[PDB]
Amino acid sequence: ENEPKEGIPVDKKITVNKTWAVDGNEVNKADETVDAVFTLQVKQRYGEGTKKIEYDGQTYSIPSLFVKWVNVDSAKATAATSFKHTFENLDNAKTYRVIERVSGYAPEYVSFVNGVVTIKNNKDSNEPTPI
Numbered sequence: 001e002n003e004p005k006e007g008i009p010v011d012k013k014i015t016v017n018k019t020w021a022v023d024g025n026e027v028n029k030a031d032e033t034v035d036a037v038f039t040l041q042v043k044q045r046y047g048e049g050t051k052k053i054e055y056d057g058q059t060y061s062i063p064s065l066f067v068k069w070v071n072v073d074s075a076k077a078t079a080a081t082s083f084k085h086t087f088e089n090l091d092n093a094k095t096y097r098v099i100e101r102v103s104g105y106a107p108e109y110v111s112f113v114n115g116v117v118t119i120k121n122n123k124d125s126n127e128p129t130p131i
Contacts, residue, residue, distance in 0.1 A: 001122075002109040006043070006097040009090040010115030014040065016087075016098055017116050020080045020105070022123040029080045036077035036102035036121065040087050041069040043095045072096065080121075 007014070016038055020027045046066040053060055075085040090096065098117045100107040105121040112118070 005109045005112035007112035016085045020121045032080035038075045040072040044070045
């Protein structure tokens, strides 16, 4: 259910290390299609700009460093089996994140350490109501 994580490349590379699951059950089904797309994003400094805002009768205009997330590259998953995708030619100095979009599942952004983004795709169960 998690919040995307950030971290830095190791040796110009960041591997997404992907598993799948239902009810926290290791799943691995090469014939089960998925449409998970992964977008790699870097935190990109654009430099010195300003924020302007009317306050108390007059425009206030404050210098601010602008830092955005911008799309670096992407990977498209194919079936519901455990895989790694290694993004390459990155900058060890910069800070990145991977955001996954997938129908059917809940990315659990588990950890991001030592070059590796670990992501467990938790399947969508219906909520069981008592009788």
